[model samples]
Target: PINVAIFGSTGSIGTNALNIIRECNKIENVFNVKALYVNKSVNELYEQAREFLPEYLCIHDKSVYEELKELVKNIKDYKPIILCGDEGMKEICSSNSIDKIVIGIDSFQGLYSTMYAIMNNKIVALANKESIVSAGFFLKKLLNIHKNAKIIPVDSEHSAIFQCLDNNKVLKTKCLQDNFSKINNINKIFLCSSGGPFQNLTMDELKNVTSENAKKITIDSATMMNKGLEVIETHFLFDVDYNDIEVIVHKECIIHSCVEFIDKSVISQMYYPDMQIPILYSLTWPDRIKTNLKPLDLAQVSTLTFHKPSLEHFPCIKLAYQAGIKGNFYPTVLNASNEIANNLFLNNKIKYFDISSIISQVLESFNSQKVSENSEDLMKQILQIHSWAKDKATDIYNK
Candidate 1:
């Protein structure tokens, strides 16, 4: 049995990962929940802690500790050692018993745990995009001396790449990053996007989009910004070039992602839009395990369609592409800025279309020359840059 920690346990990915663990335990106990982490939702964490019974329970927002403690007191039989803040997250990630570290935490916050896990040479089943996006070089450094430390991508797009042709390519390639290779058998990777809610809408129609209606997830799809984040992630995860990696609007969401080869043969991993498949595979890679999900039926939904994404409409995607190609603090700044801009839109502080506008201004604030100077303190330096981007974006939004 594998002992694992679930960071960001209250979020979508964390909950799904826990469900996978819970499901597995019923049949054969493939994984043991060693640590469960949440940012603020202590009530949900309390419920999870009671069910999974992890060895360590950490709350990033330390303010919730006493309240969480009070809530946990009523439990009869089980008690998990409670930890708080960054140091606690570090403690659980470095534990010897944890065979796999599942990073589900959002944004740059995942960087600390991600770095610790890599430094200690731990196997990681990573669902957090920020982990790979910011910690690209962190993974690059560890792979230099140790080859065993591996981060299996839990995102469906990256997971599809893993299940497809890269299974062969990953064996030939050793490092998580191959010094950002030039080219090879891989022709191009098409990251299929569900085209969000605004793919068909014009500029006038998009203006009607509000926080409530837009929260249907068309905002990310509208700007194709999420695809851009995934692009940066897919590049770092599979060592594919930014240019070779393509994004297409696949309305059905059936095809997770597709890869083209030098021989011109394309291979794609297809399944209904479900997070469970990828989460399940990340925990039990190379070997499939039993899950509550049933097999996909091709009969009822046989037809599939695709479209090309244009930067003229979805400009945040352009920022992602630009940052991914730059390396260093650019991607970090881009991610941090987009997050701030996204929040502004979500909170009704800005228009939905203004997301790209605010993010553009924030992306322009960074100095390319300065970003390369801090090689020794990459994470610390990037986080500082991340902080600046957040403030700068907020400043721009307020303006």
Candidate 2:
């Protein structure tokens, strides 16, 4: 059994992972719960500690350390070793007992831990899209060097692509050698998007959208930014050229993603939006078991709709593509700007469309310096971009 350690055990991805673990019970005999980490959700963290009885529990908020310690003390038989701060998170990632690191942290805070774990040759089940988005090419190189460090994507779209791509007999042969032979047989990758909530919004409508509205819309429609990130991710994950990967707005949420081969044969993975399916699959691949997830019902779905994303409606997507195409520090700038913009929007400090505007402005204002080609350097570049973007954001908001 793989010894699993989860970071950000209180977020959306974390909660889903925990639910799957509870249902499967697969982690008991073969898999051991080595540790669980959380940022600020003390109650949730305490509850998980009582149940999982992990060896270590981490809390980043220093103020709550004493409160957590008292809470853990009450749990009979299992007094988990508690650690605090970013250092604690790093130690957990580098722990000897941890065979798998499920990174569910949303931001770049978990970036170092993810890279550290992979460098140590630990299997990483990644839910942190930002980490991959910011350093796609660099991370791909790391995955190659650390043979045991395999990235199993937990995003529904990426996971669907993984499943569809895994079944290809051609890919198996391609994996035999270092270079992927399937590239020759592949025509294009069809990345499907839910078309976020603002798919039909007019130009004027979009201009008035606040951050909360943007989040709701992005959750529903195909945000150009997400498509751009996926473009970069698909390139790194499959070793496909950017041009070969295409994004189509698929509204149904079924037919998660599709890949077209050179001979025009299309293979696709279709499922309901329940994240547990992919989470469970990533946790245990090459071995399929029954899951409690609701299976896709095609009959109830009236029609599967597809459309080209309007760059006018969602400028962030266009910005992502442009930044990705530029490569190097540009992608880092785009990611950092979006992160800051998203936070601003979440805080209701900016309009929804401003998210893309801020990112675009940052990309334009900042000249990217080519850092070392290494993943460590790539991370540093991302942080540099973040610092720059943060200042830019403050200026924009203050203005």
Cα RMSD for candidates in order = 3.0, 3.4
Per-model TM-score, in order, reads 0.88, 0.86
Please give, for residues 122-173, the per-residue lDDT of candidate 1 as tens digits. Answer: 7777877777677676667666555667788888888887777554445555
Instruction: Evaluate model 1: give its lDDT.
Output: 0.78
Evaluate model 2: give its TM-score: 0.86
lDDT (tens digit, per residue) of candidate 2 on 135-191: 665666666777767777788887887777644443353221234426446677888
Question: Clash number for every model?
Answer: 1, 14
Model 2 residue 367 distance off true place after TM-score fit, in angstroms: 2.7
